[model samples]
Target: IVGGYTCGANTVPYQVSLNSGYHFCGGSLINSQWVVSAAHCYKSGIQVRLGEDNINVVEGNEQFISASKSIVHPSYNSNTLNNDIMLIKLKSAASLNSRVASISLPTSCASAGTQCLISGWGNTKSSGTSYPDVLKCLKAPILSDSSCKSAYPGQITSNMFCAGYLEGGKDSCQGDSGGPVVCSGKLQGIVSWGSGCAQKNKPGVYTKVCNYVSWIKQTIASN
Candidate 1:
C-alpha cells in the first residue's frame, strides 16, 4: 500500500495472502473456514495463507490452506467491477490463535468521513511494481459517494465506495485487491479497483461489505 508504514508482526491477524507461490491478493479471514476477498482476484487452486506478516520469509505462524470453494457474488460485473466481492471456503478450518484470527463483519454501513485502516502487500509506489515483503497499512477516510462518483464519473456504483486522500499519496494498489478495509475493528470494504496508486482525486475503490452481509451469511449457511 502506498504512503503507509510497515505493520508490526501479528498486528493484522485477520489478513491473509492469496498465494500461488507468491502473494497476489489480500483477503480477510471472516471465520475459521471462510475468507472475504474481491471477486476479481478469483483463480482456481488458490492457496490461502493466514498469519502472514512478511511474504519473503518462512513465518512459522502461517497456515497454508487451499480453497475448497469460491462463491462470487451473483451480480458481479467484471467490466464495471460492480459487486466485486467473493467468499472462499477453506479446504480445512483455520486454527485460531494469537497470530491467526478473524475480523468481525460490518453491521451498519460505513459513513463518509469515517477513518478506516487498510492493509496489504501491494506496491508502495505510484510508479513501478515493487511489493513490500512485510505488510503495510494506511489510514484513509471514506469519501462520500458523490465525491467518489465525481472522481470517476459513470464508474462508481452503489456496491462500491472510495477511501483515501483526494490529494493523493496513500492507497491500496495492484496486488492489494481483495484486502480488508476495517472501520472500528469491523470489516467494511474489500479492495477492488482504482485508477492507479494514490493518484490525485482518484481514491481506491472498494467493495462495500455492509451491503453484502446477508448474501455472505446465506452463502455460508446454505453451502
Candidate 2:
C-alpha cells in the first residue's frame, strides 16, 4: 500500500519513468496535455504516470501517458541551472477525474513567507534512497527574492524561487528535480536544486512558474 500524507485523504504523487525501468523524478499535471518539470530531468522516451497510489507497476489506479514531445526553455543552462524549466506534451490528454486533476498555474508571483506544498518520491532524508512507490509531501515557506539571491550569492535569478527548511534535514533531492512546489492550489515552482538534500543554510531552488507565463503561453499558441 502507498504511504505518507494522511488526513483522511490519499497522497499519491506523480512519477516519471525513463529507460523502461528506471524511475527518475516526480511531476505535476498543469493541463490536460501539459506537464511542468525541470529541463535537467528530461530524458528521451519517457512515460508519466498519474493517479497512482503506489509505484509498483501492476498496482494502484495508475494511468500511463507517453510523451509526445518535450520543450525545454531555450535559455536553459544545466551547469548554473538558469532557466531550468521544461514542459512535456503528452501524446493524449489525461482524463479529468477526482484522482487526476490538472493543477492551475499561478498567474501572479508569490512573496516571501508564502507557504506551499511540495510533493515527490525523492529521498526522505539526506543521502538516503528514494521511496520505491510512495509519494511524499512536506510544507515549506517561500523565501524573499533578495534573501534567496543573498544565500546563493549571484546565483539566484529572477527565474528562480526558493523554498524549504533553513534549519536543515528537509529538502528536495536528486530525484525530486522537476517536481511541483505548489501554492494556493496553483503551480508555482519546479524543483531545480539545493546544496544537498535537506541541508541547513541551503534551501531547494525551483523555476518560478510565474516568470515563464509568457513563454508557456507562446509555446502553447505555436504548437
Candidate 3:
C-alpha cells in the first residue's frame, strides 16, 4: 500500500493543492484570502486550488485562484529548516462555502503522542516518480519529543515536531511539503521534510504552528 489512502471529497477543505503551473506542494487555507505553505515550496507562477479532491477534473465546486505576494519568513533557515513556513496572498478572496473553508491555528499542541491528520499528493513511495493524482491522507500520531530528538539530532528545533509510523510504512513525502498537520481540528504543523519517504523510526518532521501564532496573525494583519 502507499503511505496514505485516498481521501473523500470535502474531507479536507482547508487543504490546497498548489501548482506552480504543475504539482509542487500542498498548502492550507488559513483564511479566505490567505494560504500558508512551506518557504521551500515557493516559486514563480504558483496557483492555488481549494476544495478539490482530484487534480485532473474541476468539479465546479473548487475555488481556483492565482497567488501573489508570497511572504517567506525573513529568518527562514534552509539548512536547519527552521521557520520554514510561508504565506501566500490570494489575488482575490476565495468565495467561502461549505466545500471551501479555512483552518484555525492551534492554541494547544503542547503535548506529544496525540493523533493528527495529514493529507497531500506527495509521492507514495521513495522510488515513486510522480505525485498522486488524488489527494491521500493518513493518521499520524505525534512522536514523543524525546524520541524525535534522538532521530534527528541537531536538526530538531523548538519550532518543529515529529509524527509518523516508527516501524515504517507511512509519511508525507517530497511533494507534500507545506501541507497542514491537523490536530484536534486546528492547524498544528506543516509538512516540512524527512529522511526519505517512509523509513523505520523516521517520522515526518513538521513545522510547529504553535510557535508562530503571533507571526502568522501579525503578517496577515499587516500585509
Report lDDT per candidate: 0.94, 0.75, 0.88
In candidate 1, what are the lDDT values of residues 1-223, reduced to their tens digit?
A: 9999988999999999999777899999999999999999999889999999998898799899999999999999999999999999999999999999999988899899999999999999998888789999999999998999999999988889999999998888998999999999999999999998899999999999999999999999987
Worst 10 residues of 3 by lDDT: 125-134
Q: Count clashing residue pairs in model 2.
A: 0
Better of 1 and 2 by TM-score: 1
Clash count list over all predictions: 0, 0, 0
- Cα lDDT tens digits, model 2, 1-223, are 0122421223423333322356686777877888878899888888887776455655655678888999999999988899998988889988867767777778899878989877766666576565645666777889877767766887888888788767777677776678888888778888888787776778889889998989988897777
TM-score attained by model 2: 0.90
Ranking according to lDDT, highest score first = 1, 3, 2
* Per-residue C-alpha lDDT of model 3 across residues 164-213, encoded as one tens digit per residue: 88888888888889999998999999999889878887889999988888
Better of 1 and 2 by lDDT: 1
What is candidate 2's CA lDDT for residue 66? 89
Preferred candidate (TM-score higher): 1 or 3: 1
Segments of candidate 1 deviating more than 4 angstroms: none
Put the candidates in TM-score order, highest first.
1, 3, 2
Residue pairs that clash (backbone atoms under 3 angstroms), model 3:
none
Task: Report the candidate with higher TM-score, 2 versus 3.
Answer: 3
Which stretches of candidate 3 lie above 4 Å from their native place? Answer: none
